[PDB]
Design an enzyme around this catalytic site. Structure first.
Site, PDB file in Angstrom:
ATOM      1  N   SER A  56      41.783  42.222  37.660  1.00 30.19           N
ATOM      2  CA  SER A  56      40.932  41.076  37.367  1.00 30.19           C
ATOM      3  C   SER A  56      41.116  40.528  35.956  1.00 30.19           C
ATOM      4  CB  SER A  56      39.466  41.444  37.587  1.00 30.19           C
ATOM      5  OG  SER A  56      39.226  41.726  38.954  1.00 30.19           O
ATOM      6  N   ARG A  81      34.812  51.583  29.835  1.00 25.02           N
ATOM      7  CA  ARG A  81      35.754  50.621  29.272  1.00 25.02           C
ATOM      8  C   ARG A  81      35.182  49.963  28.023  1.00 25.02           C
ATOM      9  NH1 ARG A  81      36.436  47.113  34.622  1.00 25.02           N
ATOM     10  NH2 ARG A  81      34.169  47.342  34.359  1.00 25.02           N
TER      11      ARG A  81
HETATM   12  C1  LIG Z   1      38.265  46.533  42.660  1.00 20.12           C
HETATM   13  O1  LIG Z   1      37.007  47.236  42.807  1.00 20.12           O
HETATM   14  C2  LIG Z   1      35.939  46.650  42.267  1.00 20.12           C
HETATM   15  O2  LIG Z   1      35.976  45.576  41.718  1.00 20.12           O
HETATM   16  C3  LIG Z   1      34.713  47.483  42.416  1.00 20.12           C
HETATM   17  C4  LIG Z   1      34.746  48.537  43.329  1.00 20.12           C
HETATM   18  C5  LIG Z   1      33.641  49.354  43.486  1.00 20.12           C
HETATM   19  C6  LIG Z   1      32.503  49.130  42.746  1.00 20.12           C
HETATM   20  C7  LIG Z   1      32.455  48.085  41.841  1.00 20.12           C
HETATM   21  C8  LIG Z   1      33.552  47.243  41.657  1.00 20.12           C
HETATM   22  C9  LIG Z   1      33.443  46.137  40.665  1.00 20.12           C
HETATM   23  C10 LIG Z   1      32.785  44.950  40.983  1.00 20.12           C
HETATM   24  C11 LIG Z   1      32.691  43.925  40.058  1.00 20.12           C
HETATM   25  C12 LIG Z   1      33.250  44.067  38.800  1.00 20.12           C
HETATM   26  C13 LIG Z   1      33.908  45.242  38.458  1.00 20.12           C
HETATM   27  C14 LIG Z   1      34.492  45.423  37.078  1.00 20.12           C
HETATM   28  O3  LIG Z   1      33.783  46.004  36.222  1.00 20.12           O
HETATM   29  O4  LIG Z   1      35.648  44.985  36.867  1.00 20.12           O
HETATM   30  C15 LIG Z   1      34.002  46.265  39.395  1.00 20.12           C
END
Ligand SMILES: COC(=O)c1ccccc1-c1cccc(C(=O)O)c1
Length: 242
Positions: A47, A227
């Protein structure tokens, strides 16, 4: 000039994690990292790719401005904040993958590839599916390469309009108080080993800017908060923030 400071390794080990923090002092043009090798190892951007993706989408007119609403497609996903309408600001804040997958599809492979080369972004390889290559395709970027890209963005030197860069930098706004401003993007790469978390951006002070890019092993989502926490401990140690 670059200098290695393994004292920062303490901040990762106290949480039984491993990773790298890379700092760049803009005034002095000096870099700092705890692990010179990992600082140059290339990972999936995940992301964190929402930065370049936003820039391209804005510059090509796929996104009009930061107010354009991208309607939820009605598909219930396992992340609650994704099941709603979003604009560029909220889609960044909540890392709303499905919105950016549509961005990428409307950008198309040809223009996406040509734009990432103009950005000199990572290995510039969009191999894979156009709507997920930054999650399980061939694109790779290192922490030091993140800083080089972010520095260009800060100076409006990327090969897109000034407007597109100002808008994305607005959308990157993460924290601001009387002492500093942070513009950054998180990342979570799980589809290809090793599973890692990203945090890349910079710290604005009155008289300097500190760019940063960090990644760390992330075997489960329980550690995502590390992080920011680990990064800030480094910033504190280097007396960049109180
Ligand atoms: C790829 O997997 C996830 O994104 C994910 C998977 C499990 C639980 C939360 C997230 C998530 C959701 C939103 C933002 C973040 C982050 O902090 O970049 C992470």
């Amino acid at each position: 000039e670059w200098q290695e400071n393994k004292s920062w390794n303490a901040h990762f080990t106290e949480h039984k994690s491993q990773g790298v923090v890379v700092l760049w002092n803009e005034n002095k043009q000096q870099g700092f990292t705890n692990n010179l090798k990992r600082a140059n190892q290339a990972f999936l951007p995940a992301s964190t790719f929402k930065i370049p993706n936003s820039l391209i989408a804005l510059d090509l007119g796929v996104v009009k401005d930061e107010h354009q609403v991208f309607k939820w497609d009605g598909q219930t996903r396992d992340i609650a904040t994704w099941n709603r309408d979003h604009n560029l600001i909220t889609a960044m804040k909540y890392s709303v993958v499905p919105v950016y997958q549509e961005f990428a599809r409307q950008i198309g492979e040809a223009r996406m590839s040509k734009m990432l080369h103009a950005f000199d972004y990572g290995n510039e390889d969009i191999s894979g599916n156009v709507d997920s290559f930054w999650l399980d395709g061939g694109i790779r970027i290192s922490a030091t390469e993140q800083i080089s890209f972010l520095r260009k963005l800060y100076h409006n030197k990327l090969h897109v309009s000034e407007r597109s860069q100002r808008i994305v930098k607005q959308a990157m706004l993460t924290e601001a108080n009387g002492d500093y401003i942070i513009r950054a993007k998180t990342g979570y790469s799980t589809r290809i080993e090793p599973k890692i978390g990203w945090w890349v951006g910079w710290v604005e002070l009155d008289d300097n800017v500190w760019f940063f890019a960090m990644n760390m092993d992330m075997p489960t989502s329980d550690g995502l908060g590390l992080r920011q926490a680990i990064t800030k401990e480094v910033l504190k140690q280097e007396k960049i923030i109180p």
